[PDB]
Design a protein around this ligand. Structure first.
Ligand SMILES: Cc1cc2nc3c(=O)[nH]c(=O)nc-3n(C[C@H](O)[C@H](O)[C@H](O)COP(=O)(O)O)c2cc1C
Length: 147
């Protein structure tokens, strides 16, 4: 099985989350390609992957803003080959904001409308993902069981 993980992370929490997922997947035998959104090209990006996981923190406080490095990929998701693709999303946020993990919501809805197959509800991490490390592992399990 081939997995792509693409993360947008400003302070490293969604990156940590991505690394934790990647290790879970690889330990189970998946091929895993992990890329920072800051360096990816959207065109054809999901091509040849059995599973794509997109990670993005939420910013903006009074509005939903996606993690800065992830915006160009978001704005180009129609060119990624999401139709029929198995995908799931994750990201860090903080529930004291009005729009908790709103980036995850946004990405999920964009993927769905593109015809992607969302194989699991998004992983919405409240606070430090190091304090949610067992939720991360479990979600990576759930994703493997859902494909
Ligand atoms: C000024 C500021 C604004 C934020 N806005 C939100 C928000 O609107 N929604 C949310 O759920 N978290 C928000 N957060 C929390 C960040 O998502 C959180 O710090 C997260 O761990 C950053 O993950 P990253 O290091 O992967 O970028 C904000 C954080 C800061 C400091």
């Amino acid at each position: 099985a081939k997995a792509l993980i693409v993360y947008g992370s400003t302070t490293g929490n969604t990156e940590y989350t991505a690394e934790t997922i990647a290790r879970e997947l690889a330990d189970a035998g998946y091929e895993v390609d992990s890329r920072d959104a800051a360096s990816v090209e959207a065109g054809g990006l999901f091509e040849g992957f059995d599973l794509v996981l997109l990670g993005c923190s939420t910013w903006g406080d009074d509005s939903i803003e996606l993690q800065d490095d992830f915006i160009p990929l978001f704005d180009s998701l129609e060119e990624t080959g999401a139709q029929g693709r198995k995908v799931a999303c994750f990201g860090c946020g903080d529930s004291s904001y009005e729009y908790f993990c709103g980036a995850v919501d946004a990405i999920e809805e964009k993927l769905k409308n593109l015809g992607a197959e969302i194989v699991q509800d998004g992983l919405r991490i409240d606070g430090d993902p190091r304090a949610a490390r067992d939720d991360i592992v479990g979600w990576a399990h759930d994703v493997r069981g859902a494909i």
